[PDB]
Design a protein around this ligand. Structure first.
Ligand SMILES: *[C@@H]1O[C@H](CO)[C@@H](O[C@@H]2O[C@H](CO)[C@@H](O)[C@H](O)[C@H]2NC(C)=O)[C@H](O)[C@H]1NC(C)=O
Ligand SMILES: *[C@@H]1O[C@H](CO)[C@@H](O)[C@H](O)[C@H]1NC(C)=O
Ligand SMILES: *[C@@H]1O[C@H](CO)[C@@H](O)[C@H](O)[C@H]1NC(C)=O
Ligand SMILES: *[C@@H]1O[C@H](CO)[C@@H](O)[C@H](O)[C@H]1NC(C)=O
Ligand SMILES: *[C@@H]1O[C@H](CO)[C@@H](O)[C@H](O)[C@H]1NC(C)=O
Lengths: 98, 50, 236
């Protein structure tokens, strides 16, 4: 073990792949959470990751099948309630935001 | 808020099998008074099977 | 000859897919309009520095050498195109004054790493960066028609290989051979280069900052076009 870059490493175990269900993920050290789905834009065959105007991750290539995937967060939505007034009756309705 | 349920991690293909067969499937071993040293690099070591 | 660099020396610095947006970076680049030296038969030792440009236009070029002592004392890397392949070896040697083509080196010392490429039987551009024990190599094949130095055409540079050698390099020399010349060198430096990525992902154009007032104006607003009116770039 020295300061030179490492050359030998243990065999990393590769898990499965799932889509259309907001789950945690980690690709080649890139972590995060979101929803995995296909896309249409094609990278050049030397690039990974993918960004936007807000320089945040937007796409990723699965490094076994070499295909493009898209990402999307699933944590939107505020909770709101509608009440005709507890002075008259108690039935209420619930409204989600987005 | 929606909480995630699963957790998947995918890593590149594993094809750097280290040449460890010849070390243990060796026709001859060096004499103890003059031991032979072998260095390896750029390989993945299957410590489990050993 | 002290020819002038003409809008060359730009390379994809990161593994991203920034699309249809502009972007600014802090990295080593080739400053626009720099006096680079023309070399045509003998080649002496040239002082390697952090970052270096290279272009030539034949098949005389065979490889490169890198090191400080070059006398099989401190580890030195050798790159050269085999007559049938490409040789990627890390073995300090006792080098000759004018190695060429096995008139390469006197003797082979201890060795650390080797790599043999696949059997390999105009303007080729090369840019080398060495950082944190990683050697980065960029090449871009280009069909050309001019018979002069660097033309005004604009092109990108793509990465090829990372070398985890973990060594120190201070000097270098070109490798050639003789059967029994035109190439250029450019030196990099830290700058503030704006980059434009199209929808496809190719760097169609880029703008240097700190070159001319108008360039800085483009630099601040993150745009390739500026409307009429005063602006405010920096402070004196
Ligand atoms: C990594 O290994 C997998 C193992 O399945 C390779 O998947 C292959 O995909 C092709 C595509 O049609 C199939 O024809 C093969 O049967 C699959 N298996 C094998 C062993 O080839 C995958 O191609 C490998 N990664 C790369 C980059 O080749
Ligand atoms: C609403 O409040 C007023 C306040 O006095 C009360 O008289 C009335 O009965 C309330 N409404 C109902 C439906 O009971
Ligand atoms: C060049 O290639 C030949 C055949 O591929 C090989 O035998 C030779 O060792 C190579 N040169 C070096 C310096 O390895
Ligand atoms: C370098 O090569 C010499 C050969 O004489 C050897 O004695 C020495 O141990 C080598 N150094 C290393 C670090 O292997
Ligand atoms: C952009 O990408 C499309 C789709 O691959 C292609 O048809 C077009 O020629 C590309 N244009 C440029 C300028 O790269």
């Amino acid at each position: 073990l020295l300061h030179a870059p490492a050359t030998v490493c243990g065999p990393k175990k590769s898990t499965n792949l799932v889509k259309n269900k907001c789950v945690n993920f980690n690709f080649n050290g890139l972590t995060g959470t979101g929803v995995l789905t296909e896309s249409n834009k094609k990278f050049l065959p030397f690039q990974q990751f993918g960004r936007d105007i807000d320089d945040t991750t937007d796409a990723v290539r699965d490094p076994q099948t070499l295909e493009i995937l898209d990402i999307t967060p699933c944590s939107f939505g505020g909770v709101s309630v509608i009440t005709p007034g507890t002075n008259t009756s108690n039935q209420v309705a619930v409204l989600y935001q987005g | 808020r929606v909480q995630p349920t699963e957790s998947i991690v995918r890593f590149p293909n594993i094809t750097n099998l280290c040449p460890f067969g010849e070390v243990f499937n060796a026709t001859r071993f060096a004499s103890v008074y003059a031991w032979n040293r072998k260095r390896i690099s750029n390989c993945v070591a299957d410590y489990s099977v050993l | 000859a002290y020819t002038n660099s003409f809008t060359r020396g730009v390379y994809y610095p990161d593994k991203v897919f920034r699309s249809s947006v502009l972007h600014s970076t802090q990295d080593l680049f080739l400053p626009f309009f720099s006096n680079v030296t023309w070399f045509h038969f003998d080649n002496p030792v040239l002082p390697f520095n952090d970052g270096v440009y290279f272009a030539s236009t034949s098949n005389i070029i065979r490889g490169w050498i890198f090191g400080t002592t070059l006398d099989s004392k401190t580890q030195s890397l050798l790159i050269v195109n085999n007559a049938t392949n490409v040789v990627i070896k890390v073995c300090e040697f006792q080098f000759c004054n004018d190695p060429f083509l096995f008139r390469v080196y006197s003797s082979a010392n201890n060795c650390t790493f080797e790599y043999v490429s696949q059997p390999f039987l105009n303007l080729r551009e090369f840019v080398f960066k060495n950082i944190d024990g990683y050697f980065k190599i960029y090449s871009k094949h280009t069909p050309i028609n001019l018979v002069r130095d660097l033309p005004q055409g604009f092109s990108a540079l793509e990465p090829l290989v990372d070398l985890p050698i973990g060594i120190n390099i201070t000097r270098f020399q070109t490798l050639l051979a003789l059967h029994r010349a035109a190439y250029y060198v450019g030196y990099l430096q830290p700058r503030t280069f704006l980059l434009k990525y199209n929808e496809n992902g190719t760097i169609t154009d880029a703008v240097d900052c700190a070159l001319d007032p108008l360039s800085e104006t483009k630099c601040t607003l993150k745009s390739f076009t500026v409307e009429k009116g005063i602006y405010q770039t920096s402070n004196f």
